[PDB]
Swiss-Prot record:
Chain's role: eIF-2 functions in the early steps of protein synthesis by forming a ternary complex with GTP and initiator tRNA.
Record gene name: eif2b
Molecular function GO terms recorded: translation initiation factor activity
Keywords: Initiation factor, Protein biosynthesis
Keyword Protein biosynthesis on entry: yes
Family: Belongs to the eIF-2-beta/eIF-5 family.
This protein's name: Translation initiation factor 2 subunit beta
Highest taxon, organism lineage: Archaea
Assembly behavior: Heterotrimer composed of an alpha, a beta and a gamma chain.
Keyword presence, Protein biosynthesis: yes
Span covered, complete protein: 39 to 90 of 143
Amino acid sequence: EILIEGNRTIIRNFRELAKAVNRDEEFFAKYLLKETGSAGNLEGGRLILQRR
């Protein structure tokens, strides 16, 4: 599910992500970041959050 290396973590949240895509999947992963604050990454199928 969630994996962290160095300072960036990728999450295989594709399920939600799929729904998200219809509503801007890209945008969603950003959300994860929004929630945290540090930095975020979005991929068409997986959501990634980058901690502080």
